[PDB]
Design a binder for this molecule. Structure first.
Ligand SMILES: [Cu+2]
Ligand SMILES: [Cu+2]
Length: 124
């Protein structure tokens, strides 16, 4: 259906906006990106930077991933991101999210050739 790289783009990339367009951004994005189809994915981060800039992170700061692996890389500088966290009232099928706009360093897991971001590890 898709590739691991394209899946990262679907779940974590939104280069069309410099930041969350409204407090309802996460409710809209989580749905349109098919992240609430089977269940309400609890947490998710979207990156408001060009693909090239996020892909460049694979050549930046090598750090360990949350799972112990060491194919993770942290951005040298901060990026415009939107943290989407499911609200306490949220209940599938009616997924509801709190939209939080921030500027933080991102940590992504890189794989393949071309070595590109495939998993979003965290924002710091
Ligand atoms: Cu920095
Ligand atoms: Cu993987």
């Amino acid at each position: 259906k898709e590739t691991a790289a394209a899946k990262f783009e679907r779940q974590h990339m939104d280069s069309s906006t410099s930041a969350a367009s409204s407090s309802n951004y996460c409710n809209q994005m989580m749905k349109s990106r098919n992240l609430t189809k089977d269940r309400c994915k609890p947490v998710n981060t979207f990156v408001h930077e060009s693909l090239a800039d996020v892909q460049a992170v694979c050549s930046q700061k090598n750090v360990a991933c949350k799972n112990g692996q060491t194919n993770c890389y942290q951005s040298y500088s901060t990026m415009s991101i939107t943290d989407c966290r499911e609200t306490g009232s949220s209940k599938y099928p009616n997924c509801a999210y709190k939209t939080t706009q921030a500027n933080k360093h991102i940590i992504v897991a890189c794989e393949g050739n071309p070595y590109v971001p495939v998993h979003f590890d965290a924002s710091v």
